[PDB]
Design a protein around this ligand. Structure first.
Ligand SMILES: CN1CN([C@@H]2O[C@H](COP(=O)(O)OP(=O)(O)OP(=O)(O)O)[C@@H](O)[C@H]2O)c2nc(N)[nH]c(=O)c21
Length: 163
């Protein structure tokens, strides 16, 4: 029930899943083979600089409530969770080819190639994830694709909590 991904320790608190290999198409129509976890699961994500509560279904991020030291660490947690969710809109935000041949990419599986890609630049990821109107849940705030806080709109499923 415990593992690490992208610098975060994930702790499953509810649900379960089975694993299966699956092919997915990027925004540049490149086929990647990823190990998909099938099932509804809830997690706590614990990093050095941020933590979050994550609820996910098969290839769908349902909710992510993230707190952390500042915008850079909160954004990094959001990126890791978006990649971890394996959502189609994250796969489709890859607009160029993923380099799997360079000697330094020879051991990254596709999940880690995706993570590195969006760690270098997440602008397309955030712009294509989608936004939604939000309500007045005190203690929490919305975050826009450009990472500025908002009390009216937020990246779909994502809220920022005070630390
Ligand atoms: C998306 N993931 C990824 N993951 C876990 O996160 C860790 C790293 O993921 P990964 O590198 O894609 O998979 P891993 O099995 O290590 O490697 P590979 O795909 O090369 O066979 C593993 O312990 C994996 O089981 C997950 N664990 C659970 N429970 N649910 C999930 O949705 C996921």
């Amino acid at each position: 029930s415990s593992f690490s991904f992208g610098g975060f320790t994930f702790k499953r608190t509810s649900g379960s899943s089975v694993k299966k290999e699956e092919e997915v198409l990027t925004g540049n129509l490149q086929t990647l083979k990823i190990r998909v976890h099938e099932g509804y699961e809830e997690f706590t994500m614990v990093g050095r600089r941020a933590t979050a509560i994550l609820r996910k279904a098969t290839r769908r991020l349902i909710q992510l409530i993230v707190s952390g030291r500042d915008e850079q660490s909160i954004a990094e947690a959001i990126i890791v969770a978006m990649v971890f969710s394996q959502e189609d809109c994250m796969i489709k935000a890859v607009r160029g080819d993923l380099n799997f041949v360079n000697r330094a990419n020879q051991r990254l599986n596709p999940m880690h190639q995706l993570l590195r890609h969006f760690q270098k630049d997440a602008k397309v990821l955030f712009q294509n994830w989608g936004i939604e109107p939000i309500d007045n849940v005190m203690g929490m705030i919305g975050i826009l694709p450009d990472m500025t806080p908002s009390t009216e709109m937020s990246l779909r499923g994502v809220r920022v909590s005070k630390m």
